[PDB]
Amino acid sequence: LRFPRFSQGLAQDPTTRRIWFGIATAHDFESHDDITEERLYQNIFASHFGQLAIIFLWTSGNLFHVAWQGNFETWVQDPLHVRPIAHAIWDPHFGQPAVEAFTRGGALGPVNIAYSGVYQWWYTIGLRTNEDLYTGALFLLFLSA
Amino acid sequence: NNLPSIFVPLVGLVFPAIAMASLFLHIQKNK
Amino acid sequence: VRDYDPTNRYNDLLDRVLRHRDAIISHLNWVCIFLGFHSFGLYIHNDTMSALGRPQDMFSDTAIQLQPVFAQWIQNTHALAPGVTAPGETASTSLTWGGGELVAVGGKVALLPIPLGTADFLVHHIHAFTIHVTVLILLKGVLFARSSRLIPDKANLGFRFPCDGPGRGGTCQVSAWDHVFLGLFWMYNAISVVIFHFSWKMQSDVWGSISDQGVVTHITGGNFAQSSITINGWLRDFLWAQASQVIQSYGSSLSAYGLFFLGAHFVWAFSLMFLFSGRGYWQELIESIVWAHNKLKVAPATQPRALSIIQGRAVGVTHYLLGGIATTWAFFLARIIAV
Amino acid sequence: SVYFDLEDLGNTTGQWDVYGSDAPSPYNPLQSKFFETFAAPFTKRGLLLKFLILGGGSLLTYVSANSTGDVLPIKRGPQEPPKLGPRGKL
Amino acid sequence: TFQVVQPINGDPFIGSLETPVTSSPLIAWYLSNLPGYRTAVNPLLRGVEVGLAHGFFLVGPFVKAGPLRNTAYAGSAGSLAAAGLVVILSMCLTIYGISSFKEGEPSIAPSLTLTGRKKQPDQLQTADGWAKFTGGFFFGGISGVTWAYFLLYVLDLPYF
Amino acid sequence: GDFLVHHAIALGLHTTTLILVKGALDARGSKLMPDKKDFGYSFPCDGPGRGGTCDISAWDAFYLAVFWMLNTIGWVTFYWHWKHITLWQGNVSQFNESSTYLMGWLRDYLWLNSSQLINGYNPFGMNSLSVWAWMFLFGHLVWATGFMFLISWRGYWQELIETLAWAHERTPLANLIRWKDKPVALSIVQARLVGLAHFSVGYIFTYAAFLIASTSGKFG
Amino acid sequence: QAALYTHHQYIAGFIMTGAFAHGAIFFIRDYNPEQNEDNVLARMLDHKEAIISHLSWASLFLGFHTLGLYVHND
Amino acid sequence: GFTPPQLDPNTPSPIFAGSTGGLLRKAQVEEFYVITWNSPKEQIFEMPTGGAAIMREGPNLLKLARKEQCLALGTRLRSKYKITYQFYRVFPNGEVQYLHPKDGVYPEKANPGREGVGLNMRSIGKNVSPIEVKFTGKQSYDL
Amino acid sequence: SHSVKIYDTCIGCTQCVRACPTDVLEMIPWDGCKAKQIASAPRTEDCVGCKRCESACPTDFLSVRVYLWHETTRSMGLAY
Amino acid sequence: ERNWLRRDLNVVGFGLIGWLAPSSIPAINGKSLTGLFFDSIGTELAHFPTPPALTSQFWLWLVTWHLGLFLCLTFGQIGFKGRTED
Numbered sequence A: 001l002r003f004p005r006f007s008q009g010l011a012q013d014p015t016t017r018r019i020w021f022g023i024a025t026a027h028d029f030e031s032h033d034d035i036t037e038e039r040l041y042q043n044i045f046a047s048h049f050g051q052l053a054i055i056f057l058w059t060s061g062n063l064f065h066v067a068w069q070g071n072f073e074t075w076v077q078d079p080l081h082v083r084p085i086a087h088a089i090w091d092p093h094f095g096q097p098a099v100e101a102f103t104r105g106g107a108l109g110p111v112n113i114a115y116s117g118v119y120q121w122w123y124t125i126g127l128r129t130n131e132d133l134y135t136g137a138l139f140l141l142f143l144s145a
Numbered sequence B: 001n002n003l004p005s006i007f008v009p010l011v012g013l014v015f016p017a018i019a020m021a022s023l024f025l026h027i028q029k030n031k
Numbered sequence C: 001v002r003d004y005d006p007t008n009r010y011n012d013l014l015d016r017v018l019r020h021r022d023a024i025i026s027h028l029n030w031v032c033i034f035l036g037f038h039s040f041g042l043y044i045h046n047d048t049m050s051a052l053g054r055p056q057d058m059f060s061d062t063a064i065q066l067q068p069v070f071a072q073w074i075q076n077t078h079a080l081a082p083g084v085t086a087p088g089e090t091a092s093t094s095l096t097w098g099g100g101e102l103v104a105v106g107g108k109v110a111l112l113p114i115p116l117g118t119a120d121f122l123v124h125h126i127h128a129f130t131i132h133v134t135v136l137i138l139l140k141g142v143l144f145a146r147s148s149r150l151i152p153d154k155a156n157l158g159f160r161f162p163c164d165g166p167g168r169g170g171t172c173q174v175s176a177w178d179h180v181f182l183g184l185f186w187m188y189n190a191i192s193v194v195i196f197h198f199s200w201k202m203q204s205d206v207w208g209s210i211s212d213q214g215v216v217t218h219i220t221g222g223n224f225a226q227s228s229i230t231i232n233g234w235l236r237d238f239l240w241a242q243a244s245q246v247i248q249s250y251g252s253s254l255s256a257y258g259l260f261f262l263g264a265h266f267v268w269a270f271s272l273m274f275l276f277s278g279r280g281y282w283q284e285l286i287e288s289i290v291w292a293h294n295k296l297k298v299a300p301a302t303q304p305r306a307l308s309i310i311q312g313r314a315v316g317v318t319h320y321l322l323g324g325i326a327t328t329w330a331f332f333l334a335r336i337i338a339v
Numbered sequence D: 001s002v003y004f005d006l007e008d009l010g011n012t013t014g015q016w017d018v019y020g021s022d023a024p025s026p027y028n029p030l031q032s033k034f035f036e037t038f039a040a041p042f043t044k045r046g047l048l049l050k051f052l053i054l055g056g057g058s059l060l061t062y063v064s065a066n067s068t069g070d071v072l073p074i075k076r077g078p079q080e081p082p083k084l085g086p087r088g089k090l
Numbered sequence E: 001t002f003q004v005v006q007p008i009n010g011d012p013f014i015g016s017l018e019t020p021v022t023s024s025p026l027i028a029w030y031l032s033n034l035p036g037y038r039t040a041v042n043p044l045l046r047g048v049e050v051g052l053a054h055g056f057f058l059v060g061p062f063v064k065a066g067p068l069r070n071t072a073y074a075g076s077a078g079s080l081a082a083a084g085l086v087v088i089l090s091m092c093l094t095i096y097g098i099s100s101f102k103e104g105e106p107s108i109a110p111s112l113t114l115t116g117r118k119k120q121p122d123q124l125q126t127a128d129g130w131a132k133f134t135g136g137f138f139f140g141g142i143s144g145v146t147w148a149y150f151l152l153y154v155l156d157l158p159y160f
Numbered sequence F: 001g002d003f004l005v006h007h008a009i010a011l012g013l014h015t016t017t018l019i020l021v022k023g024a025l026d027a028r029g030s031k032l033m034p035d036k037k038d039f040g041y042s043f044p045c046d047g048p049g050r051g052g053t054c055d056i057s058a059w060d061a062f063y064l065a066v067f068w069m070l071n072t073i074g075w076v077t078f079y080w081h082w083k084h085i086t087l088w089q090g091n092v093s094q095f096n097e098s099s100t101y102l103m104g105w106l107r108d109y110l111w112l113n114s115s116q117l118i119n120g121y122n123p124f125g126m127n128s129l130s131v132w133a134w135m136f137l138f139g140h141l142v143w144a145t146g147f148m149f150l151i152s153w154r155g156y157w158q159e160l161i162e163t164l165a166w167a168h169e170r171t172p173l174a175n176l177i178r179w180k181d182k183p184v185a186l187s188i189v190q191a192r193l194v195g196l197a198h199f200s201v202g203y204i205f206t207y208a209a210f211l212i213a214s215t216s217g218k219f220g
Numbered sequence G: 001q002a003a004l005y006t007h008h009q010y011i012a013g014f015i016m017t018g019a020f021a022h023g024a025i026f027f028i029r030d031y032n033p034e035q036n037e038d039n040v041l042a043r044m045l046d047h048k049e050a051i052i053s054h055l056s057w058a059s060l061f062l063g064f065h066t067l068g069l070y071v072h073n074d
Numbered sequence H: 001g002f003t004p005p006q007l008d009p010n011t012p013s014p015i016f017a018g019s020t021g022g023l024l025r026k027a028q029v030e031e032f033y034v035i036t037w038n039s040p041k042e043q044i045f046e047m048p049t050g051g052a053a054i055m056r057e058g059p060n061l062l063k064l065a066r067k068e069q070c071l072a073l074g075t076r077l078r079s080k081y082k083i084t085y086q087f088y089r090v091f092p093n094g095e096v097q098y099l100h101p102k103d104g105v106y107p108e109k110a111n112p113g114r115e116g117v118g119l120n121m122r123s124i125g126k127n128v129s130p131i132e133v134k135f136t137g138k139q140s141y142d143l
Numbered sequence I: 001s002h003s004v005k006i007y008d009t010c011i012g013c014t015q016c017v018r019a020c021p022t023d024v025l026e027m028i029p030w031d032g033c034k035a036k037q038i039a040s041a042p043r044t045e046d047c048v049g050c051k052r053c054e055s056a057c058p059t060d061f062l063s064v065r066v067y068l069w070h071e072t073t074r075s076m077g078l079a080y
Numbered sequence J: 001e002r003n004w005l006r007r008d009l010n011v012v013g014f015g016l017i018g019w020l021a022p023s024s025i026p027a028i029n030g031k032s033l034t035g036l037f038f039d040s041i042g043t044e045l046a047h048f049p050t051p052p053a054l055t056s057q058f059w060l061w062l063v064t065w066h067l068g069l070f071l072c073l074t075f076g077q078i079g080f081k082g083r084t085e086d
């Protein structure tokens, strides 16, 4: 046996089709070798847990980056005349005009302007300082764990 | 800060190389 | 496929070609890959460098020159031919060789020397790449018509057959007819690139109006040299700018070209239904339609059938070519009649 | 005209060495003792992979981290005041 | 009548042909003397030669076409990039050798010459031989890059 | 114009539903293939016999409905974006007059609103919209690359790969290296998925770049 | 606003395609004709031709007349 | 009551100039095929690998890389030249397996003594549903 | 190897066994049809999956069926 | 596969002489093609190592001379070898 572990038919393919089809059939538990109903249900349960962990990590990352590199406290005072910042840019391929052009908002370097509307959502529910976002990110990291 | 000068190369050049080498060794293995 | 018979019509030159076809096809494959990498890749490098804010790292007449010195030598040789290598001639064969004279008729420029630079190098290598790929598809199709390592008995199946089934991993498009079907698309690509090059170069460097003091104002103002070295330049200064004539032609005598523009767009897009789909779906769909015709006693005695695999391929390619060529035709005529 | 043999399948299947050479070593013997001494640490395939990975990881991040603004335009930073966006935005 | 092209080794049922490009005496002599085809030599020594030759070459393109070509740091940056590429190639060679060869197995190189004489199969096709080759190649490549940088930017030789 | 575009939306919804429902109901068999249930959910064809049987599985019915879904959502989003752009600029009469003919759409929505986006970088410099123009071209390239896998099918490519094996095995200094998996062309169903992923990614990236660039250039 | 609208509409379209895909997969892998005799689920397979033909008629009618009106206006 | 023919290695081969469609590393590592036939005169025939060859009068021997190539050549021989043929699979170890005609009688002629393999004693519409073989190693067919 | 199955609706035409590009199929004696014959499939390790046999069967629905399955070197038609 | 050219080095001298003899006739306004090529060679060595310019006449003379020389060499080889095979 070899990759894939869950397919005796695929594991004996002498061509490059073994890898491609090994990748594409990983999550089809019903067609794996020596599969039962109980194992199927338990695998589905574990996969759902993993999906929830990924979602919590994603939200925590968004919050941490907005708190660390954004302009949330400046945007709060004058919402209609400030551009929200998603995160910072660090690209060694950039030229000097590119460094100057992307320096917008109130930042000291190149940044990205956020268009996901997280600033308005967080301002509406009562978050006002960068300390709140850090606490939220820590709580979501704990939830993912 | 100076952290992006480390983590961006770490995630773009080192981790991909390690992962690709390990994955190739795994998929090429036989017994 | 049909008339080849070595038992009564043996020829040594044709026999020897068929005995080393693998080397020919592999060498042509490598040449095509090399030309594609070293011709189109230079355009992507230019686009990336321009987007990053580094115009000094581009392949251009100002940063990194790629001069076509072989064509310039030929131009110089042809410009100095009269009196040295063609004593009986008074002037050169053409005004484009670079003699330096200008011919103007009725306030317009007829012909004048055509300079060559970095952009011409790139576009000429693009032409070479496209022609080589087309020659690959057609020559592979001719050389493997009778047999191959995949299907030893291919000559018994004929010249125009769809496949030899889902076996051997799958055998769609193995006949010689399919190699012509695939080479039509590459011929279209190459000719489109050639005619675009001709149009932009003529409008930028040759055609224009001449004043009393002797100053030439070209149609587009000589932007070919600096704008054509990027794909964004072709999208912006050629397709976006020069399509304003055809999209503003409604309400005037040129509205027929405006209508044909959209009609050819529709015809081109309509061909993708036949190219991306397969026969079994449409034959299954017809079965349901025939059911309701039987209900009302209007079922024809000539049983409806879906198109064959070859017929569908042919319809798709025909509609694809018609739409594309008609679109370009309307665009060119509407642009050039107005200006 | 017999190209098939059962006792010898090396010639039948064409297992020939087209360009291989059996001539002895042409390098100087003292020169050979130098390289067989000093290249020897790198000849263990288990250690070489780890060494290369660790060295590449450490060297790349160190060069990146202490790079100056005369090499990287992004380490230097902007040098001009910013311009306002549309609708009078920052 | 004289004919130039002949089947490979006289067997018309093997998928190759013998042409002046493949079997010319000058071409045959030239290829047999390259390090990759010296089957009777320690793989370390062939690897050292290959590494030296390949590392020496790589400096030029990186130095001349690099992003810092028009600055005072052209040579150092180019040499460092060449060394990095050599390191990556060494990693690739090590990975290939680990994947392909198993410890304790005999060599898989052919043991028959074109004239039918029996020969000792090449030891480069074993795990130990490939490991020695890779370790020689790395040491050779680093040495060649360093030599090229030294010649170009420590001695003011009248190049170009 | 709202009337016409609403009926276009209805046409798109009905056609997509037709394709998906026909795929779901004919999954267990039909007149052309009575025993389709014995071959699974996904399989290439039943060969060239009985007139030819390309795309006869339910998976192929799903594969053909993604193109119609993308078309319908594109129409919906084009309608929404043009209406709101004209509303925000304060010139709703432009949409009212120019939305009753297709040349009006092509000229006053796509051509007119793409001027700033295609000027992100030019021979005179660059600005903050450079990345969006680059993504515009990237999406165009990825979309067109999908047509290769959709128009050209397997048996052309397996014959082409067979010559490269000979070329590698006959090349000096390179035949010392050999593969472990024998190289082959992609399968019949693989190329449908690979073509369709390229088509969707190009569609999404191109429209996202155009929308964001056009809105943010004018209103920030 | 435009980004949020486009994002959610495209996601909804993909989800709607997936629903029908998994319905077909159910009909292939899990359906049992004997346990489902003559119920609502089984009677749908009986008259699939009528449903498909009426969907075809609706699509053809809409497409014909919408395209005709647009081309007339052009 | 049939003893398969032995393979005579000293059989001469047809006159051929060589081609690029011959054997490769698979023949060295895996099996390859040999086809033999008897000819009444010298004549020209088309090689399945591309080109043309002259067959000798008397016994003939040929190596090929696939079972499809040698059965394509044998079909051509029997259809056009009216010639009988045999073919074998040769392993790198040295074992020769006789393959065809197998009985000495060709497959299209019904011959007593042949066993039935893969016969399902029902019509194709009587196969069970996939639900009835779920979570087992079997298929709807071969059941 | 692929799976090739025969059903008792076979009429003994021989057309499937004449069509196969590799020797997979053969005729055996039988009783149940006028021809007193049925196809047999003894050598399915040599099947390439071409379906030439199914194009040749005159029965309303095929008395020979091919189900594609695990792929090997022989079933892929590789001469590398 | 060896000695594929059927080496006969008398061809090199015969071809060279049979090109240099007619090409030395001064029918070009009192000058010969060989003479023009040799004068061009002499002129471009006065600024060694700077290469000839794009507008120099050296390249034309080089190509035209070597075309005839290669034709003479090839036809000499074909004639010498073909006498024994036909």
Ligand code: CLA
Pocket: C029, C032, C033, C034, C035, C036, C037, C040, C041, C044, C133, C136, C137, C182, C185, F141, F144, F145, F146, F147, F148, F149, F151, F152
């Ligand atoms: C825009 C879409 C598109 C693109 C990019 C290609 C590209 C190609 N086609 Mg093609 N084709 C297309 C559409 C397209 N086709 C369509 C619609 C059809 C009709 C069905 C065909 C039909 C067709 C046929 C019939 C054949 C090809 C062949 C080829 C290849 C030519 C050889 C070569 O190296 O070219 C140059 C390659 C490129 C320009 C692609 C590279 C793009 C640049 C250089 C980016 C490079 C990135 C770099 C590697 C780093 C990336 C790393 C990563 C981590 C980011 C080339 C890959 C031929 C072939 O197989 O090769 C001979 C061939 O026979 N095509």
Ligand code: CLA
Pocket: C288, C289, C290, C291, C292, C293, C296, C298, G053, G054, G056, G057, G060
């Ligand atoms: C007299 C001929 C005739 C009649 C009575 C019908 C009647 C019908 N067709 Mg129909 N059809 C016909 C010819 C005909 N068709 C032809 C020739 C085609 C091929 C182009 C079709 C293709 C077709 C499709 C694809 C569909 C129908 C459908 C339908 C039904 C919906 C009503 C409708 O108008 O659909 C619209 C019908 C059309 C747009 C057909 C075009 C009209 C043609 C040009 C008329 C030709 C008449 C013919 C030449 C008679 C000559 C008479 C002369 C000898 C004296 C209806 C029962 C639909 C249905 O319910 O599905 C089952 C459906 O989806 N038809």
Ligand code: CLA
Pocket: A092, A093, B008, B009, B012, B013, B014, B017, D053, D055, D056, D057, D059, D060, D063, E066, E067, E077, E080, E081, E083, E084, E085, E087, E088
């Ligand atoms: C996403 C991750 C990522 C990162 C962080 C970089 C970073 C970089 N790229 Mg890059 N690149 C990437 C992805 C990435 N690239 C991809 C996906 C492509 C394919 C399209 C490219 C294609 C590309 C090209 C074509 C070029 C770069 C260049 C560069 C360098 C910018 C110029 C410079 O500082 O020269 C200064 C250079 C030096 C000081 C020497 C090299 C730096 C170290 C010391 C090399 C040795 C490191 C180590 C020994 C080897 C790696 C270890 C391994 C574990 C990773 C910079 C280090 C340019 C360059 O100069 O590269 C050499 C260049 O020409 N890149």
Ligand code: CLA
Pocket: C266, C269, C270, C271, C272, C273, C274, C276, C277, C285, F015, F018, F019, F064, F067, G056, G059, G060, G061, G062, G063, G064, G067
């Ligand atoms: C722009 C391209 C395009 C167009 C116009 C269509 C149009 C259509 N598709 Mg479609 N499709 C396309 C692309 C396209 N598709 C693509 C890319 C795919 C993915 C592969 C599909 C997949 C697809 C499926 C899966 C299905 C359709 C179906 C349909 C039809 C239902 C819509 C309707 O009401 O008819 C609109 C009516 C017309 C277009 C009629 C115009 C008639 C004019 C008058 C013709 C004039 C003839 C000529 C000028 C006169 C003779 C001159 C001579 C030179 C010819 C419709 C014909 C469905 C179908 O056929 O079932 C009902 C169906 O099930 N399509």
Ligand SMILES: CC1=C(/C=C/C(C)=C/C=C/C(C)=C/C=C/C=C(C)/C=C/C=C(C)/C=C/C2=C(C)CCCC2(C)C)C(C)(C)CCC1
Pocket: F024, G019, G020, G022, G023, G024, G026, G027
């Ligand atoms: C109160 C009110 C109202 C109401 C409304 C309503 C009543 C609505 C409805 C709605 C609806 C009513 C909707 C619906 C929908 C549906 C759908 C969307 C469907 C789908 C389906 C599917 C997807 C399927 C699947 C499947 C198959 C195919 C087979 C197997 C089974 C299954 C199920 C899996 C109004 C507004 C008037 C007014 C105001 C008030």
Ligand SMILES: CC1=C(C/C=C(\C)CCC[C@H](C)CCC[C@H](C)CCCC(C)C)C(=O)c2ccccc2C1=O
Pocket: C273, C274, C275, C277, C278, C279, C282, C305, C306, C307, C308, C309, C312, C313
């Ligand atoms: C749309 C489509 C069809 C369906 C198209 C069909 C059936 C073609 C025939 C359509 C015309 C309109 C039939 C005309 C019939 C009569 C001539 C009508 C006479 C009445 C008046 C018009 C005079 C296929 O059959 C097909 C097959 C293989 C690959 C792709 C496709 C494909 O894409």
Ligand SMILES: CC1=C(C/C=C(\C)CCC[C@H](C)CCC[C@H](C)CCCC(C)C)C(=O)c2ccccc2C1=O
Pocket: F148, F149, F150, F152, F153, F154, F155, F157, F184, F185, F186, F187, F188, F191
């Ligand atoms: C181009 C083409 C090929 C040939 C293409 C091949 C063999 C490409 C193979 C992959 C190469 C090596 C490029 C891989 C690029 C990926 C970005 C790398 C892997 C990414 C991972 C995430 C998997 C087919 O095999 C084919 C088969 C059937 C119908 C159409 C086609 C078809 O159009």
Ligand code: SF4
Pocket: C162, C163, C164, C165, C166, C170, C171, C172, C173, C278, C309, F044, F045, F046, F047, F048, F052, F053, F054, F055, F188
């Ligand atoms: S029917 Fe279509 S998909 Fe099937 S093998 Fe033939 S061409 Fe390929």
